[PDB]
Amino acid sequence: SVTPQHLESVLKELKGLLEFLDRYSQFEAQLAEQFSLQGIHQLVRKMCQALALWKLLCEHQFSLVVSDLQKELQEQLKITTFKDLVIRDKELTGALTASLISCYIRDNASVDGISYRLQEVCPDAVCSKANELLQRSRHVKQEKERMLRESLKEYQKISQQVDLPNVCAQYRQVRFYEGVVELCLSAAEKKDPQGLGLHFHKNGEPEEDMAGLQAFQERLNSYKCITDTLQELVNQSKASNEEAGIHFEQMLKLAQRSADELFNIALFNWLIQADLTDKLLELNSPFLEPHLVRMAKLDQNKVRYMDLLWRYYEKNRNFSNAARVVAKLADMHSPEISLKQRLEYISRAILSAKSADGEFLHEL
Amino acid sequence: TMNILFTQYKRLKGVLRSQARALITFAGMIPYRMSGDTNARLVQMEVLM
């Protein structure tokens, strides 16, 4: 609303008043006036910074900057009187600041200068700098990878509030998938620093643990990034095909180093939902066996799980275990099993058997 | 027989399933103790498809 010069003269008179207040500040009623003067002074500091910021934005094409702001935020700016701007709506302030830093970071100019200007006028500097580094990393082989790793360290340093979807998206634009992976896992770890989600899931996701459920959900949101990246890789692998497929393979062989038990569980859930049961047999995970036996006893659609269990145990050469698995699978009263598949199982059973057990044989 | 059909799915890779199934089921019903390592190769190859 105010071009830079009126704001400069106003800041001149205002910082003059501030000088007076600081100079004379040492010189039920008195304490009351002291509270009122303290409020006046703190508001004055807020107002000096605010007018400096308004001039800062108007000197940098205010219309374009707030044009990037949200239309609802623009309308709220239309109804906001600057008294409410300084007093109550720090959100519009942070949003306009982010909008200007975003204008700069999309214009691919260094953010250090605007950052120092902000820190000097209304103390987002390091955030803007990292943003510039990342966005420029799309326009820069060895050096590109180096800058990608540096932006990765930067964005994982602030992994609490980093917009994981957009960061991973720009990391997908430069084929820097390892960045998306490490950033997803770092955001997960830092988001739930105690692992309340793992205790929740391990306790059976009992409904009473709102905090455990919440931390698990936040880890899930973090992992959703790597999930989407792998899904895009596989989709473009099927539509280039082999390139995005190697993207998928590299993403997954990365995610297979992951030690988060709930993450292995979710990965299993997705993969089985993804019908890649071969890749399921193809990767080493502790919880698979557990998660399997659990789901098999708990899903009530056990047929799928139990078959997969006989399979996996076979691939691990655990003959008698897979044996008993398929054995129950066959015996199970269920309408989804016709005599044929039953006998075919019992066959595979005796065969894995010849591969106490003598009793099992005698029974069978 | 199963080694052959295996190589068949091998070349097709590098019905066969239902045929292999018929063979394994035969092995099971057969009132004669085939040798052990026999059963071993049978089960393993039946899996690897």
- Tell me if residue A110 falls in helix, strand or coil: coil
Question: How far does A353 lie from chain B, in Å, by closest CA?
Answer: 9
Describe the crossing of helices A125-136 and A142-157 by its angle, rounded to 10 degrees. 150
A130, A155 contact by CB (below 8 A): yes
Interchain proximity B25–A344, CB inside 8 Å: yes
Q: Are the beta carbons of A291 and A265 closer than 8 angstroms?
A: yes
Q: Do A352 and B27 touch (CB under 8 A)?
A: no
Q: In angstroms, rounded to a whole number, what is the distance separating the alpha carbons of residues A132 and A128?
A: 6
The CA distance from A129 to A230, in Å, is 29
Q: Is A74 helix (H, G, I), strand (E, B) or coil?
A: helix
Chain B interface, mutation test: which of A355, A362, A364, most B Cβ atoms within 10 Å?
A: A355
Chain A residues contacting B, CB < 8 Å? 311, 314-315, 343-344, 346-352, 354-355
What CA–CA distance (Å, rounded) separates A244 from A250?
A: 10
Gap between the Cα atoms of B1 and A158, Å rounded: 62
> Which residues of B are less than 8 Å from A350 in CB distance?
28
Task: Centre a 10 Å sphere on the Cβ of residue A122 and count the other Cβ atoms it contains.
Answer: 18
Spatial separation of the C-alpha atoms in residues A32 and A39, rounded to whole Å: 11
Distance of alpha carbon B7 from alpha carbon B20, whole angstroms = 12
φ/ψ region of A317 (left if φ > 0, alpha if ψ in -120 to 50, else beta) reads: left
- DSSP-assigned letter for residue A292: H
What resolution in angstroms, rounded to 1 decimal?
4.2
What distances in angstroms separate CA A286 from CA A201, A274, A283, one per listed residue?
Answer: 16, 20, 10
Burial label for A305, CB within 10 Å (0-12, 13-18, 19+), is buried
Q: Read off the tokens for A213.
A: 């459920």
C-beta atoms of A351 and B29 within 8 A:
no
SS3 content of chain B, % helix, strand, coil (to 5): 80, 0, 20
Asked whether B46 and B1 are in contact (CB, 8 A), the reply is no
> Chain A contacts of B21, Cβ < 8 Å?
344
- Residue A271 CB neighbours (<10 A): 19
Contact A14, A41 (CB under 8 A): no
Tokens 């091998």 correspond to B10
Among the listed residues A314, A315, A318, the one whose alpha carbon sits nearest the alpha carbon of residue A345: A314
Which residue, A290, A271, A231, A230, is CA-closest to A254? A230
What is the Cα–Cα distance from A232 to A227, expressed in whole angstroms? 9
Distance of CA A279 to the CA centre of its chain: 25
Question: Is A354 in Cβ contact with B39 (below 8 Å)?
Answer: yes
Closest Cα partner for A259 from A280, A279, A286? A286
Alpha helices, DSSP H, located in B1-49: 2-13, 16-29, 36-48
